[PDB]
CSV table of C-alpha atoms in Angstrom, one decimal:
chain,number,residue,atom,x,y,z
A,1,UNK,CA,66.1,102.2,182.0
A,2,UNK,CA,64.1,100.9,179.0
A,3,UNK,CA,67.4,101.1,177.1
A,4,UNK,CA,69.3,99.6,180.1
A,5,UNK,CA,66.7,96.8,180.2
A,6,UNK,CA,67.3,96.2,176.4
A,7,UNK,CA,71.1,96.2,176.7
A,8,UNK,CA,71.0,93.9,179.8
A,9,UNK,CA,68.8,91.3,178.0
A,10,UNK,CA,71.0,91.3,174.9
A,11,UNK,CA,74.2,90.9,176.9
A,12,UNK,CA,72.8,88.1,179.1
A,13,UNK,CA,70.2,86.0,177.2
A,14,UNK,CA,71.2,82.5,176.1
A,15,UNK,CA,69.9,79.1,175.1
A,16,UNK,CA,72.9,76.8,174.5
A,17,UNK,CA,71.9,73.5,172.9
A,18,UNK,CA,74.1,70.5,172.4
A,19,UNK,CA,74.3,69.4,168.8
A,20,UNK,CA,72.3,66.3,169.8
A,21,UNK,CA,69.5,68.5,171.2
A,22,UNK,CA,69.5,70.6,168.1
A,23,UNK,CA,69.3,67.5,165.8
A,24,UNK,CA,67.1,65.2,167.8
A,25,UNK,CA,65.2,67.1,170.4
A,26,UNK,CA,64.9,70.8,169.4
A,27,UNK,CA,62.6,73.4,171.0
A,28,UNK,CA,59.1,73.3,169.5
A,29,UNK,CA,58.1,75.9,166.8
A,30,UNK,CA,55.9,77.7,169.5
A,31,UNK,CA,58.9,77.7,171.9
A,32,UNK,CA,61.1,79.3,169.2
A,33,UNK,CA,58.6,81.9,168.3
A,34,UNK,CA,58.0,82.9,172.0
A,35,UNK,CA,61.8,83.0,172.4
A,36,UNK,CA,62.3,85.2,169.3
A,37,UNK,CA,59.6,87.6,170.3
A,38,UNK,CA,61.3,88.3,173.6
A,39,UNK,CA,64.4,89.6,171.9
A,40,UNK,CA,64.5,93.5,171.9
A,41,UNK,CA,65.0,95.0,168.4
A,42,UNK,CA,67.6,97.5,169.6
A,43,UNK,CA,66.5,99.8,166.7
A,44,UNK,CA,67.8,103.4,166.9
A,45,UNK,CA,65.2,106.1,166.5
A,46,UNK,CA,65.8,108.9,164.0
A,47,UNK,CA,66.0,111.3,167.1
A,48,UNK,CA,68.9,109.2,168.5
A,49,UNK,CA,71.0,109.8,165.4
A,50,UNK,CA,72.5,113.3,165.1
A,51,UNK,CA,74.1,113.0,161.6
A,52,UNK,CA,72.9,115.9,159.4
A,53,UNK,CA,71.9,114.8,155.9
A,54,UNK,CA,71.9,111.0,156.6
A,55,UNK,CA,68.3,110.6,155.5
A,56,UNK,CA,69.0,110.8,151.8
A,57,UNK,CA,71.4,107.8,152.2
A,58,UNK,CA,68.9,105.5,154.0
A,59,UNK,CA,66.7,103.1,152.0
A,60,UNK,CA,64.3,102.9,155.0
A,61,UNK,CA,63.7,105.8,157.4
A,62,UNK,CA,63.3,103.5,160.4
A,63,UNK,CA,66.3,101.2,159.7
A,64,UNK,CA,69.4,103.1,160.9
A,65,UNK,CA,72.9,102.1,161.8
A,66,UNK,CA,73.6,102.0,165.6
A,67,UNK,CA,76.1,104.9,166.3
A,68,UNK,CA,78.6,102.9,168.4
A,69,UNK,CA,79.3,100.4,165.5
A,70,UNK,CA,78.5,102.4,162.4
A,71,UNK,CA,81.0,102.4,159.6
A,72,UNK,CA,82.5,105.9,159.0
A,73,UNK,CA,83.7,106.9,155.6
A,74,UNK,CA,87.0,108.7,155.2
A,75,UNK,CA,87.6,111.6,152.9
A,76,UNK,CA,88.4,109.8,149.6
A,77,UNK,CA,85.3,111.4,148.0
A,78,UNK,CA,86.1,114.9,146.7
A,79,UNK,CA,82.4,115.3,145.8
A,80,UNK,CA,80.8,114.7,149.3
A,81,UNK,CA,81.6,116.1,152.8
A,82,UNK,CA,80.1,113.6,155.3
A,83,UNK,CA,81.2,110.2,156.7
A,84,UNK,CA,77.8,108.5,156.6
A,85,UNK,CA,76.8,105.1,155.2
A,86,UNK,CA,74.0,102.8,156.5
A,87,UNK,CA,76.3,100.0,157.6
A,88,UNK,CA,77.6,98.5,160.9
A,89,UNK,CA,80.6,96.5,161.9
A,90,UNK,CA,79.5,93.1,163.1
A,91,UNK,CA,81.3,90.8,165.6
A,92,UNK,CA,81.9,87.2,164.7
A,93,UNK,CA,82.7,83.9,166.5
A,94,UNK,CA,83.3,84.5,170.2
A,95,UNK,CA,82.8,88.3,169.8
A,96,UNK,CA,85.8,88.8,167.4
A,97,UNK,CA,85.7,92.4,166.2
A,98,UNK,CA,84.8,93.5,162.7
A,99,UNK,CA,84.4,90.1,161.1
A,100,UNK,CA,81.4,91.5,159.0
A,101,UNK,CA,79.9,94.7,157.8
A,102,UNK,CA,76.1,94.5,157.6
A,103,UNK,CA,74.7,97.1,155.2
A,104,UNK,CA,71.6,97.9,153.1
A,105,UNK,CA,71.6,97.3,149.3
A,106,UNK,CA,73.2,100.5,147.8
A,107,UNK,CA,71.0,103.1,146.2
A,108,UNK,CA,72.1,104.9,143.1
A,109,UNK,CA,73.3,107.9,145.3
A,110,UNK,CA,75.3,105.6,147.6
A,111,UNK,CA,77.1,103.4,145.1
A,112,UNK,CA,80.4,105.4,145.4
A,113,UNK,CA,80.0,105.3,149.2
A,114,UNK,CA,79.7,101.5,149.1
A,115,UNK,CA,82.8,101.1,147.0
A,116,UNK,CA,84.7,103.6,149.2
A,117,UNK,CA,83.8,101.4,152.2
A,118,UNK,CA,85.0,98.4,150.4
A,119,UNK,CA,88.3,100.2,149.6
A,120,UNK,CA,88.9,101.7,153.0
A,121,UNK,CA,88.0,98.6,155.0
A,122,UNK,CA,90.0,96.3,152.7
A,123,UNK,CA,87.0,94.2,152.0
A,124,UNK,CA,87.8,91.2,149.8
A,125,UNK,CA,84.4,89.4,149.9
A,126,UNK,CA,80.9,90.7,149.3
A,127,UNK,CA,77.9,88.4,150.1
A,128,UNK,CA,74.6,89.7,148.5
A,129,UNK,CA,71.2,88.1,149.5
A,130,UNK,CA,68.3,88.8,147.3
A,131,UNK,CA,65.3,87.4,145.3
A,132,UNK,CA,66.1,87.9,141.6
A,133,UNK,CA,67.8,97.7,144.1
A,134,UNK,CA,70.3,99.2,141.6
A,135,UNK,CA,73.2,97.0,140.2
A,136,UNK,CA,76.3,98.6,141.7
A,137,UNK,CA,78.8,96.3,139.9
A,138,UNK,CA,79.4,96.5,136.1
A,139,UNK,CA,78.6,94.1,133.3
A,140,UNK,CA,82.1,94.7,132.0
A,141,UNK,CA,83.6,98.0,133.4
A,142,UNK,CA,82.2,101.1,135.2
A,143,UNK,CA,83.6,104.1,137.1
A,144,UNK,CA,81.9,105.1,140.4
A,145,UNK,CA,83.3,108.3,141.8
A,146,UNK,CA,87.1,107.6,142.1
A,147,UNK,CA,86.8,103.8,141.7
A,148,UNK,CA,86.9,101.8,138.5
A,149,UNK,CA,85.4,98.3,138.7
A,150,UNK,CA,86.0,95.5,136.1
A,151,UNK,CA,84.6,92.0,136.0
A,152,UNK,CA,87.5,89.5,135.7
A,153,UNK,CA,85.5,86.2,135.9
A,154,UNK,CA,81.9,85.2,136.4
A,155,UNK,CA,80.6,81.7,137.2
A,156,UNK,CA,77.2,80.3,137.8
A,157,UNK,CA,76.3,77.9,140.6
A,158,UNK,CA,72.8,76.7,141.6
A,159,UNK,CA,71.2,79.6,143.5
A,160,UNK,CA,74.4,81.7,143.5
A,161,UNK,CA,76.7,83.6,141.0
A,162,UNK,CA,80.4,84.3,141.8
A,163,UNK,CA,81.9,87.4,140.3
A,164,UNK,CA,85.6,88.2,140.5
A,165,UNK,CA,86.0,91.9,140.4
A,166,UNK,CA,89.0,94.3,140.4
A,167,UNK,CA,88.6,97.7,142.0
A,168,UNK,CA,91.0,100.4,141.0
A,169,UNK,CA,91.8,103.5,142.9
A,170,UNK,CA,94.5,105.7,141.3
A,171,UNK,CA,97.4,103.4,140.4
A,172,UNK,CA,96.3,100.7,142.9
A,173,UNK,CA,94.3,97.6,142.0
A,174,UNK,CA,92.6,95.1,144.3
A,175,UNK,CA,90.6,91.9,143.9
A,176,UNK,CA,87.1,91.6,145.3
A,177,UNK,CA,85.1,88.4,145.2
A,178,UNK,CA,81.3,88.9,144.9
A,179,UNK,CA,78.7,86.3,145.6
A,180,UNK,CA,75.0,86.9,144.7
A,181,UNK,CA,72.7,84.5,146.3
A,182,UNK,CA,69.4,84.7,144.5
A,183,UNK,CA,66.3,83.0,146.0
A,184,UNK,CA,65.6,84.6,149.3
A,185,UNK,CA,62.6,86.9,149.3
A,186,UNK,CA,62.4,89.7,151.9
A,187,UNK,CA,60.6,88.9,155.1
A,188,UNK,CA,60.7,85.2,154.2
A,189,UNK,CA,63.0,82.2,154.0
A,190,UNK,CA,64.4,79.9,151.2
A,191,UNK,CA,62.2,76.8,150.6
A,192,UNK,CA,65.2,74.6,151.5
A,193,UNK,CA,68.5,75.0,153.4
A,194,UNK,CA,70.9,73.1,151.1
A,195,UNK,CA,71.9,76.1,148.9
A,196,UNK,CA,72.4,78.4,151.9
A,197,UNK,CA,75.0,75.9,153.4
A,198,UNK,CA,76.8,75.7,150.0
A,199,UNK,CA,76.9,79.5,150.1
A,200,UNK,CA,78.4,79.2,153.6
A,201,UNK,CA,81.0,76.7,152.4
A,202,UNK,CA,81.8,79.1,149.4
A,203,UNK,CA,82.4,81.9,151.9
A,204,UNK,CA,84.6,79.7,154.1
A,205,UNK,CA,86.6,78.5,151.1
A,206,UNK,CA,87.4,82.1,149.9
A,207,UNK,CA,91.1,83.1,150.3
A,208,UNK,CA,92.0,86.3,152.0
A,209,UNK,CA,93.3,88.7,149.2
A,210,UNK,CA,93.8,92.0,151.1
A,211,UNK,CA,96.9,93.4,152.8
A,212,UNK,CA,95.3,93.1,156.2
A,213,UNK,CA,92.3,90.9,156.9
A,214,UNK,CA,89.1,93.0,156.5
A,215,UNK,CA,85.4,92.5,157.2
A,216,UNK,CA,83.2,90.4,154.9
A,217,UNK,CA,80.5,92.7,153.5
A,218,UNK,CA,77.0,91.1,153.8
A,219,UNK,CA,73.9,93.0,152.4
A,220,UNK,CA,70.3,92.7,151.5
A,221,UNK,CA,67.8,95.4,150.8
A,222,UNK,CA,67.4,96.5,154.5
A,223,UNK,CA,70.7,95.0,155.7
A,224,UNK,CA,69.0,93.3,158.7
A,225,UNK,CA,66.7,90.3,157.9
A,226,UNK,CA,68.4,88.1,155.4
A,227,UNK,CA,71.7,89.8,156.3
A,228,UNK,CA,71.2,88.8,159.9
A,229,UNK,CA,70.1,85.2,159.0
A,230,UNK,CA,73.2,84.7,156.9
A,231,UNK,CA,75.7,85.9,159.6
A,232,UNK,CA,73.9,84.0,162.3
A,233,UNK,CA,74.1,80.8,160.2
A,234,UNK,CA,77.8,81.2,159.7
A,235,UNK,CA,78.5,81.9,163.4
A,236,UNK,CA,76.2,79.0,164.3
A,237,UNK,CA,78.1,76.6,161.9
A,238,UNK,CA,81.4,77.8,163.5
A,239,UNK,CA,80.1,77.0,167.0
A,240,UNK,CA,78.8,73.5,166.0
A,241,UNK,CA,82.1,72.7,164.2
A,242,UNK,CA,84.4,74.0,167.0
A,243,UNK,CA,82.3,73.0,170.1
A,244,UNK,CA,79.5,70.5,169.1
A,245,UNK,CA,77.0,73.0,170.5
A,246,UNK,CA,75.3,76.2,169.5
A,247,UNK,CA,73.6,79.2,171.3
A,248,UNK,CA,71.4,80.6,168.6
A,249,UNK,CA,69.6,83.0,171.0
A,250,UNK,CA,73.0,84.4,172.1
A,251,UNK,CA,74.1,84.8,168.5
A,252,UNK,CA,71.0,86.8,167.6
A,253,UNK,CA,71.4,88.9,170.8
A,254,UNK,CA,75.1,89.6,169.9
A,255,UNK,CA,74.1,90.6,166.3
A,256,UNK,CA,71.4,93.0,167.6
A,257,UNK,CA,73.9,94.8,169.8
A,258,UNK,CA,75.9,95.4,166.6
A,259,UNK,CA,72.9,96.4,164.4
A,260,UNK,CA,69.3,96.8,165.4
A,261,UNK,CA,66.7,94.4,164.0
A,262,UNK,CA,69.0,91.6,162.8
A,263,UNK,CA,66.8,88.6,161.8
A,264,UNK,CA,63.6,90.1,161.0
A,265,UNK,CA,61.0,87.3,161.6
A,266,UNK,CA,60.1,84.3,163.9
A,267,UNK,CA,59.9,82.1,160.7
A,268,UNK,CA,63.5,83.2,159.9
A,269,UNK,CA,64.6,82.3,163.5
A,270,UNK,CA,63.0,78.9,163.0
A,271,UNK,CA,64.6,78.4,159.7
A,272,UNK,CA,68.0,79.2,161.3
A,273,UNK,CA,67.5,76.2,163.7
A,274,UNK,CA,66.6,74.0,160.7
A,275,UNK,CA,69.7,75.1,158.7
A,276,UNK,CA,72.0,74.6,161.6
A,277,UNK,CA,70.5,71.1,162.3
A,278,UNK,CA,71.2,70.4,158.6
A,279,UNK,CA,74.8,71.6,159.0
A,280,UNK,CA,75.2,69.4,162.1
A,281,UNK,CA,74.2,66.3,160.1
A,282,UNK,CA,76.5,67.2,157.2
A,283,UNK,CA,79.6,67.5,159.6
A,284,UNK,CA,82.3,64.9,158.8
A,285,UNK,CA,82.5,61.5,160.5
A,286,UNK,CA,81.7,57.8,160.0
């Protein structure tokens, strides 16, 4: 029943706020921290995961992908026998399936796994959140297992770099857009929310380039704190734009059902409210 209690909370908690309340009368910092601390982590224990050999492919022993939503790799790697990657499908706006994949930053031994996921899930956009983990993309051209990656273009913006990559598997070539957002330390927040919202706009402006729409890959070293903050921000912006309201509690609860631990800190939860209040004031009108 501890698990039942956890799952019931995450399915039912909610604090919808009109855009006016968000902008002009938000909950206090102490209210937001108390609210955040009530949310169950929904972390899976190593004992809950029966996937032999998975440990060598996790950056952090206690940060594991929930089994019901984990990404399983197909058999495109002739070198390895398992289907394991530390990554989860994440629902988006109104619970839409597989809008994102949240994953840890690749380690040297999981770089081929990462590109296999990108290929198999027809990913066309990767969002990386860091404070400037191995570089898994080339300066010019590298081969990772059966995948050749080449940089086609690279452009610099304030606080993010856009790379346009090509991924080749056999005679097939695909385009992948890669955005590296570079001033977000682990367990903390950016000093301002302006750049983050430009990153959100960059993401929204990105064309679909795959055969079928695929998840957006979002990662940061653990795949939960900054990763969770980014996805929550995008979903929150979508709610504000479509409905003139936002339920940030319910967004974080929906993310935690998909991957344990999403949004790592009360300060991050507070910054999420600030960022969304900023998005609300930037919305078009008079």
